Design a protein around this ligand. Structure first.
Ligand SMILES: Cc1c[nH]c(=O)c(C)n1
Ligand SMILES: Cc1c[nH]c(=O)c(C)n1
Lengths: 215, 217
């Protein structure tokens, strides 16, 4: 049994978090998440789905559920880049971690979500050492660097697949790469993975980002 | 008071986290942090300090406690890059965020700590990247990085397992390579060139606790 002292940690652990059941119906949300999502008491999340929150995030409720079902059917954990206008009238950006929620004998009974606010050197063989992209180009590049395929990028940005190939070709040539693989390596070796394009921060989207341990 | 579902969620939330009192005595640690730190029964953390965990991390316990005291005294949140050997026999890198812990009436009674495994998305959150004509060697980039984040020469020596004189050597090699005339101008030029977002890849197997950012809330 937990002391009240330890329960205050439960109440004050920073971030935007909670859990849903197998139908992605909310079971708990901490106060920070409830306020974010437009509610004065986070208890009003319980029993509702992502479609039913008074918040523009509900326009991506179908993406949230597909994410949730992936964690549930596979047991893998995912990292989601979430960028949305919110009931407070501001755009926010988060990485939401999603992991399976397990019961007392270990079986998956839902998902846990945990969100955090998102607030010219070259790599050499050993060490480091020492081109102007379009808004559209830098958006396509950022998504390609995190493992997203062209049909993924077409959906996120709301353009045709052929158009993503258009921007991919410019990038490949702007970096002087002879293939998409070389484009990725060259861009990574120049710090392109560590910056979110500022125009991407005003495009509503929910996309899983490929994630790897370092090293 | 908590329901069975809220207790279950509390026990499965990701990360390696817990809280400490005003003297950084542990009051709670989740299972993930217990296991990482060598205490498979995580309530064994309670009432210990960082000096008393069964873990090579304790060599940096004085630095952990200086970070905790900063959060307590200022009310700021800090993010720390933490690289250490661990009782499982491996090196682990993490970002640890430290937040004031407050009582029923709002005053600070300690700190909350929350660690993430160093991953692609995790470094993105802190705006740094890792490498998988002005040229820097492996050891020079390590020195330069530790210089950018406030480490004194004797601290740098400890991280790199060498002597201060050796460290002075690399520091002068960087001052002439950047054309800077002092350590001040060297930090300024390297920052001006965007070295403030690089973590040299060879630091992932050297022991260090380094504050990356400090935030008002
Ligand atoms: C804002 C947000 C994104 N994805 C989610 O699943 C949840 C619960 N909230
Ligand atoms: C491993 C580790 C790093 N820094 C800390 O303060 C804590 C609580 N643990």
């Amino acid at each position: 049994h937990l002391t009240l002292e330890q329960i205050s940690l439960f109440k004050q652990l920073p971030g935007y978090w909670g859990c849903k059941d197998l139908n992605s119906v909310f079971v708990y949300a901490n106060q920070a998440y409830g306020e974010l999502i437009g509610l004065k008491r986070a208890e009003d999340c319980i029993g509702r789905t992502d479609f039913e929150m008074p918040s523009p995030t509900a326009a991506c409720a179908a993406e949230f559920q597909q994410q949730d079902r992936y964690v549930i059917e596979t047991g893998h954990s995912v990292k989601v880049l979430d960028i949305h206008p919110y009931p407070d009238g501001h755009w926010h950006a988060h990485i939401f971690t999603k992991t399976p929620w397990r019961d007392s004998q270990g079986k998956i009974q839902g998902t846990i979500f945990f969100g955090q606010d998102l607030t010219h050197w070259v790599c050499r063989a050993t060490g480091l050492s020492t081109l102007k992209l379009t808004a559209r180009e830098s958006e396509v590049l950022f998504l390609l660097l995190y493992g997203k395929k062209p049909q993924h990028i077409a959906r996120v940005m709301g353009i045709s697949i052929k158009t993503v190939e258009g921007y991919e070709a410019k990038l490949r040539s702007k970096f002087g790469a002879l293939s998409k693989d070389q484009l990725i390596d060259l861009a990574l070796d120049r710090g392109f993975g560590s910056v979110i394009p500022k125009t991407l921060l005003r495009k509503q989207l929910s996309v899983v980002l490929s994630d790897h341990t370092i090293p």
